[PDB]
Design a protein around this ligand. Structure first.
Ligand SMILES: O=C[C@H](O)[C@H](O)[C@H](O)CO
Ligand SMILES: O=C[C@H](O)[C@H](O)[C@H](O)CO
Lengths: 148, 148
C-alpha cells in the first residue's frame, strides 16, 4: 500500500526518518515535502497529503509538524479525510479501529523518534472495526455534507 | 468568557469534572451533553459545541471522548473551527499560541484527571501570537473555502 508523507520545517527531520523506516518495510512512499529546514506553512503540505489520500493516489498519509496540530486541522478540512494526532500507540490503534483514520499526525517536538516509530508501526497494522464506528464515521460525513 | 463543553459517554465523567473546575474559576459553562453513560455518537456533541463556538454563543469549547480523536475530527469539519487534541500542557499552549485553537479536545481514557486539568488551565490562559501564525490560519481558511 502507498503511504503519502508530508511536513512543514517543524516536522522535516522526523519525516526523513519515517520515510526511511517505511521503505525498509516495503511500503511505497510518496514524499510531498517540505524538502528542507526553510520556514514553510503547514497547511500547504497537509493539503497535498490529504488530497493524495482523497484521490486514491495514496492509500493513507502521515503528516508531521512541531506538534501535529496545525497540519492535521488543515488535513481534516478536506471531506473524507480523518487525520488523527497521536502521541502514543494506544491513540494510534484506536484511531484505526474506531475512527478509521486515513491520516496519522505527529509532532516532531513532542514525541521522540522511537516513540514516533512505535506509533507509526501500530497505526499501519491496526484495522477498522465497523459496526457502530461506521455509523459514527457516517455522522462525520453528515457534517461535511452540511458545510459542503 | 463562556466555555461550551460536550462529550460522548466515553468523555462524560471527565466532562463533569472539567465543568466543576471551570465554574469554581468563575467561567460561564454551557454543557451540551451527553448527560449520562448511555452509548451516544461523538459527532453530535462535537457539532453542538463547534456550532456554538462558531455562532459566538460560546467563546471557546472543550470536547471530550475516549481519545479526543473522533469528536475533534468532527468539530474540525465546521469552518472557522480549530479543534486541538492535546495530551500535555505544551501542546495545549502551542495550540493557542500558534493555531489559535478555539476547541480543546481531550481523551478521558488517555489523560488522567489532574493531567487533564493541567492541560485545560494551560489552554485557557495561553494567547494567540499572530504574525506568521495568522498567515497559516488563513491558509486553513483557504482549504475550508475550497470545499465549501
Ligand atoms: O502546528 C504547526 C507546527 O508547530 C510548526 O512546525 C511550528 O509553528 C514551527 O514554527
Ligand atoms: O473517538 C471516540 C471515542 O474513542 C469513544 O468514546 C469510544 O468509541 C467509546 O466507545
Amino acid at each position: 500500500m502507498k503511504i503519502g508523507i508530508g511536513s512543514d520545517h517543524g516536522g522535516y527531520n522526523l519525516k526523513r526518518e519515517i520515510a526511511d523506516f517505511l521503505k525498509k518495510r516495503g511500503y511505497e512512499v510518496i514524499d510531498f515535502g517540505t524538502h528542507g529546514n526553510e520556514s514553510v506553512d503547514y497547511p500547504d503540505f497537509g493539503l497535498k497529503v490529504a488530497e493524495a489520500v482523497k484521490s486514491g493516489e495514496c492509500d493513507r498519509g502521515i503528516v508531521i509538524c512541531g506538534t501535529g496540530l496545525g497540519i492535521s486541522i488543515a488535513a481534516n478540512k478536506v471531506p473524507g479525510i480523518r487525520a488523527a494526532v497521536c502521541t502514543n500507540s494506544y491513540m494510534a490503534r484506536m484511531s484505526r479501529e474506531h475512527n478509521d483514520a486515513n491520516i496519522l499526525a505527529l509532532g516532531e517536538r513532542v514525541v521522540g523518534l522511537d516513540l514516533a516509530l512505535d506509533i507509526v508501526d501500530t497505526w499501519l497494522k491496526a484495522e477498522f472495526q465497523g459496526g457502530r464506528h461506521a455509523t459514527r464515521v457516517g455522522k462525520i460525513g453528515e457534517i461535511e455534507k452540511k458545510y459542503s
